Design a protein around this nucleic acid. Structure first.
Ligand code: MG
Length: 49
RNA sequence: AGUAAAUUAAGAAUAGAGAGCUUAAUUGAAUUGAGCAAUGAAGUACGCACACCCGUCACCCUCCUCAAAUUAAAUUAAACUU
């Protein structure tokens, strides 16, 4: 049993910036984050700050 | 331990009727042993006495024995003289 995280791929946007996506589940909530390799720390949740 | 707590929603059943019941969700803890030891099991030893006691005195009836003398009921060797 490999207790080692399964690294996600690194996709590319139309602009060409690198980004990865992953799902998360806590209680009944489910989230789908889309981290970008380069940014200024701007997190937008459901299109809101 | 997503527990307690708190806050919500729905459902069953009714024509209507619960502060009840069932189910779902949200927020979300504190604590978990230097005893003073309660049960249930395991092991361990011992305690108990039955198969779930004696003593005295209480009324009851019976045989038994001795027992004071009394009253008797009755018994028994027979010898001896000419
Ligand atoms: Mg009602």
């Amino acid at each position: 049993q490999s207790k080692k995280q399964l690294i996600e791929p690194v996709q590319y946007d139309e602009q060409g910036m690198a980004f990865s996506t992953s799902e998360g589940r806590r209680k009944s909530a489910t989230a789908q984050a889309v981290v970008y390799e380069h940014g200024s720390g701007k997190i937008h949740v459901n299109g809101v700050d």
